[PDB]
Design a protein around this ligand. Structure first.
Ligand SMILES: [Zn+2]
Ligand SMILES: [Zn+2]
Lengths: 501, 529, 200, 96, 238
């Protein structure tokens, strides 16, 4: 119904002295006469329209996945009211719709929900690239203000998705804090002049081992909040654990349950003592079983290797995320274990002790780059992807998310069609290609920008370095090809075939 | 067959003649060749001599006795012999994409240093050197054509003065050649490899024969006023162009008897029809579909030797749709391309001994994804090969090429490009404080004399850095096809070269395609509906 | 002053010929100095332009041949000097070309970049002519035959580089790396021409 | 008679060591760290190996040399940063 | 040809300090010796790692040998006969050192002179005594440095002398940007940015607004502004 949004906005503008920019022939906004002028700003507004994500990988005593605010675009544009003329007209229309969005027909609510999509939909006319970019920037400042507001509270934002916001509380306080957490987040949301953000804090994690969206060990989600009494089983996608060899995957998962149980037990021990030191005790607790099972597994691998039946299972499945060397996949297992352990800052010394023990188990230098993990993510993401049925706005990560996760969005059961997925992926890819074609050079010593079309080396002593060349764009093209083998993607296949030529 | 007997024979034939080394294995090769000679090996001597001469001419390598590469040498020899016992128009007129044309770079030592374009996934992406050298190459071609033209004017006329040498003296007058652009101070700046100077647009008379837009080279005369630091140019003249024949004779023979033979053949050639439908053909409209069907019926009577399909094949821009209407816009774009292939093949004389050339447009995808209504980079991206399917098999003569398409004509040269450059000129025509036919003549003079197809700043329109050689008017074709929907349709000849403007497919209410006879050197336009 | 440009050119040419001559071995032909060549080309064109001005000069008022014709004759002297300098340089170039042709194409700067086109086909056709001399009559002797008197036909030679077997007139011979081989002089000479043999 | 030789060595261990050395001289209590300091560490390793009396340097003896040098550096720092720096280098200290 | 050895002040170069404090030597001596050069703090912990690798490699005999032979076969080519060649080729210096220079130098010499004028433009208030004589030592420097570069091993004088003069220009600019040196322009860009986010509009519109399209501010004051801003504010990374 974004065309209805177009006709209503046209009616609203016709009321004012300014006149609509609607143009059926070209869905691009029709401002002035050109409607087609191209410059650096023209590509600037359409591109980089992705929600920035803040991630702090760690393990914490009391973590809450929190409310998980939705439809932040309309909330932000309403809160902005607390070019400028079009902004004021749109703010008045949005306030009118919000008044209609409350205690009225469901059509008003649907129109309010789809207004955000219309603001970003190129197919819908009266769509301005400046409008989309400015709404994106407003959402950026909204996330910044939310972060600042959370900063005042004695809690740290360990993750930020702009769809779900993740904060852990510094204090080791028990169950009563969860009710106190609800009271404090009520107090937090009451303070600013907003009312459109999602309430009902949810999915608190009594323990969380935060790596990324897909690797975590959150426990005891939203409930009567008894602090692990009704312990929800640790939800753990493990997009890296899937990467692993199918035989080493159960071992890694079993040991991460063992690790989780050990840290939990040390957590009750520390809580009883008080009536991350708990993690520090946990480290010494699981050190002996870890080291004993490591060599055991290494000793087994000594004969396990060179077995045609075993090597068929031992081969690491080829996944779009990683390009690391094989490096004895069992060694990959212990390196991944180190990485997931390295989150706890206090235990990092004990983690170093365990690494020294392991390099005694298998010969290797105490500190080594080869011993370093350097896990590749290779996340291919379309900025601010939307599901027309659900109207939710969220970046969709094709490589990292599960095969059905790309297909079906989390909010509503409706599944994304493949054609739009390929269209958006190719959109980002080539848009980056022209960006590569329209960059501005940067010097070596002075580091100025290429204000000169006839430069031939900087007027500074240094030459023009540059920012982002072709080679890793080509490897990204190779990742696109790998996805194309993974997912049919005939439009993507055609795009790849064209790009090769 | 009997190597040792051939051993001294082959030694005499090869080693004594050329000092060439033959292995036992290649000598065995010659042995089975003698075996293939059913007759006794007497005239194999001359045969082996011709073998040696061909090997020396082609391979130019030691160790001929390979029997592997030597086997290929034997195959080439028998092909040549078969050609010995047995003792064009389609070879020329080839359609080349933007990247197909060989790259050329200016060099003071060698007037045009040979370069190479790029069909590689890594190769097609331009480089930092490509960034600097596209600008530098425009300037160098401008400088060399200007110095040749100034030699022509007077041993030469007034000479340009290095921007750096300008400011050294305040009140002195100088000749300049540089690229005009807006200075970040706010003034109009003329920029060359030596530097850049802000230009006082006052007291400046333009040359009425040429357009003038930012991002163009220019020959100017005036005072600099080093205290004022802005060049008080008096007279402003676009850099004079050079005729294709004059450019060739200045740069020497490059790829006379062959050219004159091809010219005679083309003059012998008759009724070769070059048909251009016109700008912005739309496959969506049914009335336009019927008009195009009637046009194809007309072309069925005489299949044109050239057919041009213009940009914006679809009526409205095609692009990604997250709010899909259960069917992607790209799917309609594909179906529109698939359609009319049967219509082309339905008419039997049509699409037989014919060629259809397609030009991308802003409404076309890969040119609408970059910018829905607008066009993207200056060398426009052709449609995906997937959208080319079943129309390439139904119609064998359809050619999918980028917007800067060229034809390597045997007696002439034809450059095909579609854009609304007239609108860009009009919105960028400069005012100097100091008619359609006339303005088209001025546009033609501007395009030819400036020596670039689209002399515009890369910021205004993205230009392929490694492909900038094509965007420069290095060849100066005798005939150049430039389709401007905005501009009035016309055909004009300038500096010994003809410029043809197909214009819109339908001017006001009637379909209209051109027809051109290269031998007759005249363009005719018909009307339908 | 006009020949001074030619003077620098001929000094450069004498430097090149000294460089080649001092080394008995082959010297790769240096880059063709077409910069100076073209400079002299413009000078001679403008020299011709000034000669035309002398003709028109007279047609107008420089009718004092004693003076005007003297000036024209002087111009003639300058242009002849330039021409003779260019002839000397080009002849020296061609002598180098013939030397290299005999030493490489006849005895068997491979790159032509140092060489201009005209002289490229010149040297190619000169090699063809050499072959023609080899062709037909005098085929019995090698037109580019070794100018050293033959010492001994049978000599032992160690293989410089391993290149497998190479067929001789009658005897099989494998070029096994560093293998002594005591045979007639023709084969060893021709392989020295390719350099696959050594140490005599 | 004894001349221990660095035939075996830990390149990247020393690399990370000098890396940590960096962005610490920014401290007001921290003196600049230079290449000659690294050469000093190397010669301290040589002195340790000579002290071990083996004709071949030992990797772990070289590790104790690293430990001694880094401890000297830490002592050179201001006590305020000294604690933060000692925690930072604790990832190196345990290996000795 | 004297090669100096002076650690300017307090040991370190102290580029972020006034050149008079930095250069204990009198600037007249600097001009008369005609050369200027800087060693600064590299930082670049990755490059520091690589330097450590190189130093240990040359330090450990087993690695030392392979770098030694690698340098010898291609580059280090018997340093003694490098000295022999240097003697022979300084005998080859003397014959001629500006055949190819003349035409290009006729422009580039006055070019570099103009960039020196640019430098005094950034160094208004004279930036004290040290910066004034640098232009004269530089104009003599070009003349002596073309001969220094010899035309390279052969006939490559101007094309590289341009880069070398650029290197020297920025060398002095690291000390001639201010009389605290870079610290003063850093303070300038800070007292600039103290309004840019909170006020001073955004996106060049404010620059089109204040001082009537900043025209009076543009020629000198705004240029000084951007020269300070640029350091703190698709070809190399990806
Ligand atoms: Zn949905
Ligand atoms: Zn610079």
């Amino acid at each position: 119904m974004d065309y209805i949004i177009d006709v209503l906005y046209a009616r609203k503008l016709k009321k004012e002295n300014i006149v609509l920019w609607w143009n059926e022939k070209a869905p691009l906004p029709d401002h002035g006469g050109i409607q087609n002028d191209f410059d650096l700003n023209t590509s600037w507004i359409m591109n980089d329209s992705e929600f920035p994500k803040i991630n702090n990988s760690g393990v914490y005593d009391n973590v809450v996945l929190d409310v998980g605010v939705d439809n932040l675009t309309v909330n932000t544009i309403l809160t902005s009211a607390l070019s400028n003329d079009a902004l004021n007209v749109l703010r008045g229309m949005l306030k009118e719709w919000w008044d209609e969005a409350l205690k009225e027909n469901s059509t008003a609510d649907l129109l309010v929900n789809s207004l955000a999509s219309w603001v970003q939909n190129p197919n819908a006319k009266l769509f301005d690239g400046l409008l989309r970019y400015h709404v994106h920037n407003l959402t950026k400042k909204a996330l910044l203000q939310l972060v600042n507001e959370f900063s005042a509270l004695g809690s740290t934002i360990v993750y930020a998705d702009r769809n779900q916001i993740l904060i852990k509380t510094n204090k080791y306080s028990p169950e009563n804090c969860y009710a106190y957490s609800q009271y404090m987040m009520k107090a937090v949301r009451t303070n600013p002049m907003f009312s459109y953000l999602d309430l009902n804090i949810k999915r608190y994690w009594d323990l969380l081992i935060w790596m990324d969206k897909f690797n975590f060990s959150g426990l005891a989600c939203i409930e009567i909040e008894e602090k692990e009494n009704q312990d929800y089983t640790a939800v753990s996608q493990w997009q890296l654990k899937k990467f692993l060899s199918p035989i080493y995957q159960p071992e890694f998962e079993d040991w991460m349950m063992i690790i989780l149980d050990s840290m939990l037990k040390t957590k009750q021990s520390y809580l009883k003592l008080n009536s991350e030191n708990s993690l520090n005790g946990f480290s010494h607790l699981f050190s002996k079983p870890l080291m004993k099972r490591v060599k055991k597994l290494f000793k087994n691998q000594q004969e396990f290797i060179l077995d045609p039946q075993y090597e068929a299972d031992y081969v690491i499945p080829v996944l779009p995320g990683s390009h690391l060397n094989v490096k004895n996949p069992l060694l990959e297992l212990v390196k991944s274990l180190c990485h997931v352990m390295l989150l706890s800052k206090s235990t990092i010394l004990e983690i170093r002790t365990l690494r020294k023990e392991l390099l005694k188990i298998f010969e290797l230098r105490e500190f080594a780059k080869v011993a370093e993990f350097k896990d590749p993510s290779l996340s291919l993401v379309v900025p601010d992807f939307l599901c027309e049925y659900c109207f939710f706005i969220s970046d969709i990560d094709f490589c990292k998310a599960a095969p059905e996760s790309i297909f079906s969005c989390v909010r509503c059961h409706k599944a994304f069609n493949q054609v739009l997925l390929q269209e958006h992926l190719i959109q980002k890819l080539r848009s980056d290609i022209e960006s590569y074609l329209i960059q501005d050079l940067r010097c070596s010593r002075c580091h100025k920008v290429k204000r000169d079309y006839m430069s031939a080396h900087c007027p500074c002593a240094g030459a023009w370095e540059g920012t982002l060349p072709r080679e890793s764009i080509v490897q990204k093209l190779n990742v696109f090809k790998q996805v194309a083998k993974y997912y049919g993607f005939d439009i993507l296949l055609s795009c790849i075939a064209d790009l090769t030529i | 067959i009997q190597p040792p007997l051939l051993r001294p024979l082959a030694y005499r034939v090869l080693s004594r003649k050329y000092g060439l080394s033959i292995k036992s294995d290649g000598l065995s090769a010659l042995a089975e060749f003698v075996g293939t000679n059913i007759g006794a090996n007497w005239r194999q001597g001359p045969a082996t001599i011709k073998f040696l001469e061909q090997f020396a001419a082609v391979w130019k390598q030691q160790e001929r006795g390979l029997f592997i590469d030597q086997s290929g040498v034997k195959e080439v020899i028998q092909e040549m012999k078969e050609r010995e016992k047995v003792e064009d128009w389609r070879d020329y007129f080839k359609v080349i994409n933007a990247s197909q044309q060989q790259r050329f770079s200016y060099n003071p030592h060698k007037m045009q240093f040979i370069f190479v374009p790029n069909g590689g996934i890594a190769g097609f992406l331009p480089d930092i050197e490509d960034k600097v050298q596209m600008f530098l190459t425009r300037y160098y071609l401008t400088n060399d054509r200007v110095m040749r033209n100034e030699n022509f004017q007077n041993s030469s006329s007034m000479s340009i003065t290095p921007i750096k040498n300008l400011l050294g003296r305040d009140a002195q007058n100088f000749l300049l050649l540089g690229l005009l652009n807006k200075n970040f101070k706010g003034n109009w700046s003329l920029e060359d490899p030596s530097g850049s100077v802000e230009i006082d647009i006052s007291q400046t008379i333009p040359t009425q024969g040429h357009y003038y837009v930012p991002g163009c080279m220019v020959l100017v005369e005036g005072i600099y006023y080093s205290v004022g630091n802005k060049f008080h140019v008096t007279s402003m003249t676009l850099p004079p162009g050079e005729r294709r024949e004059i450019t060739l004779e200045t740069i020497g023979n490059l790829d006379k008897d062959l050219k004159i033979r091809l010219h005679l053949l083309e003059k012998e050639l008759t009724d070769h029809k070059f048909v251009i439908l016109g700008a912005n053909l739309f496959l969506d409209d049914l009335k336009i579909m019927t008009a195009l069907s009637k046009i194809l019926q007309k072309l069925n009577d005489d299949p044109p030797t050239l057919l041009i399909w213009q940009g914006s094949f679809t009526s409205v821009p095609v692009f990604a749709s997250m709010s899909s209407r259960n069917i992607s816009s790209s799917t309609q774009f594909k179906n529109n391309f698939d359609a009319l292939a049967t219509l082309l093949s339905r008419f039997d004389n049509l699409t037989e001994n014919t060629t259809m050339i397609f030009i991308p447009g802003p409404n076309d995808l890969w040119g609408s994804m970059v910018s829905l209504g607008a066009s993207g980079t200056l060398p426009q991206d052709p449609i995906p090969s997937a959208f080319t399917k079943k129309i390439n098999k139904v119609c064998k003569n359809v050619v999918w090429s980028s917007n800067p398409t060229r034809i390597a004509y045997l007696s002439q040269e034809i450059v095909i490009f579609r854009d609304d450059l007239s609108g860009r000129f009009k919105r960028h025509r400069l005012e100097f404080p100091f008619q359609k036919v006339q303005e088209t003549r001025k546009l033609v003079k501007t395009i030819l004399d400036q020596g670039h197809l689209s002399p515009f700043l890369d910021s205004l329109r993205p230009i392929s850095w490694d492909l900038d050689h094509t965007l420069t008017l290095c060849p100066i074709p005798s005939t150049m096809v430039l389709c401007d929907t905005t501009s009035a349709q016309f055909d004009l000849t300038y500096n010994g070269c003809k410029v043809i403007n197909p214009g819109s497919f339908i001017h006001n209410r009637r379909a209209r395609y051109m027809e051109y006879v290269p031998s007759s050197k005249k363009t005719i336009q018909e009307e339908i509906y | 002053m006009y020949g001074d440009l030619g003077n620098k050119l001929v000094l450069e040419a004498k430097r090149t010929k000294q460089l080649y001559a001092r080394s008995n071995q082959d010297v790769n032909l240096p880059m063709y100095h077409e910069d100076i060549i073209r400079n002299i080309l413009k000078e001679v064109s403008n020299l011709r332009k000034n000669t035309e001005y002398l003709k028109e000069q007279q047609q107008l008022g420089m009718l004092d041949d004693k003076v005007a014709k003297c000036q024209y004759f002087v111009t003639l002297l300058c242009m002849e000097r330039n021409k003779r300098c260019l002839l000397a340089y080009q002849r020296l170039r061609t002598d180098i070309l013939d030397s290299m042709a005999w030493n490489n194409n006849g005895l068997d700067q491979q790159d032509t970049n140092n060489l201009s086109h005209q002289e490229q086909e010149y040297l190619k056709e000169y090699c063809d002519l050499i072959t023609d001399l080899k062709s037909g009559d005098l085929v019995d002797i090698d037109l580019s035959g070794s100018l050293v008197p033959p010492s001994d036909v049978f000599i032992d030679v160690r293989v410089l580089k391993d290149a497998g077997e190479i067929q001789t007139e009658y005897g099989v011979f494998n070029l096994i790396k560093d293998s002594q081989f005591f045979v007639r002089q023709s084969d060893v000479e021709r392989l020295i021409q390719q350099g696959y043999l050594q140490k005599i | 008679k004894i001349y221990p030789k660095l035939h075996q060595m830990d390149m990247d261990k020393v690399s990370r060591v000098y890396a940590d050395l960096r962005r610490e001289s920014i401290s007001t209590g921290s003196f600049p760290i230079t290449v000659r300091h690294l050469e000093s560490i190397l010669r301290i390793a040589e002195s340790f190996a000579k002290m071990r009396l083996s004709e071949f340097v030992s990797s772990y003896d070289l590790d104790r040399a690293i430990k001694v040098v880094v401890d000297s550096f830490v002592d050179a720092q201001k006590v305020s940063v000294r604690r933060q720096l000692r925690r930072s280098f604790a990832i190196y200290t345990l290996g000795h | 040809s004297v090669l100096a050895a002076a650690n300017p002040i307090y040991g370190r170069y102290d580029d972020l300090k006034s050149p008079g404090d930095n250069i204990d030597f009198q600037t007249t001596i600097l001009s008369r010796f005609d050369m200027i050069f800087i060693v600064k703090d590299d930082h670049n912990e990755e490059r520091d790692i690589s330097i450590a690798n190189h130093v240990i490699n040359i330090h450990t005999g087993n690695a030392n040998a392979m770098q030694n032979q690698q340098e010898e076969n291609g580059s280090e080519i018997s340093i003694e006969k490098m000295k022999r060649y240097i003697t022979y080729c300084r005998l080859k210096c003397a014959p001629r050192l500006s055949p190819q220079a003349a035409e290009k130098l006729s422009s580039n010499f006055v070019t570099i002179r103009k960039q020196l004028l640019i430098n005094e433009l950034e160094s208004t208030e004279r930036s004290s005594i040290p910066i004034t004589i640098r232009q004269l030592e530089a104009i003599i420097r070009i003349t002596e440095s073309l001969a220094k570069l010899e035309l390279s091993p052969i006939a490559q004088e101007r094309h590289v002398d341009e880069a070398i003069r650029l290197f020297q220009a920025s060398t002095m600019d690291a000390a001639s940007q201010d009389p605290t040196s870079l610290s003063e322009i850093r303070r300038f860009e800070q007292e600039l940015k103290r309004r840019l986010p909170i006020g001073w509009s955004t996106s060049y519109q404010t620059l089109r607004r204040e001082f009537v399209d900043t025209h009076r501010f543009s020629q000198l004051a705004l240029d000084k502004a951007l020269y300070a801003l640029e350091k703190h504010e698709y070809r190399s990374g990806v």
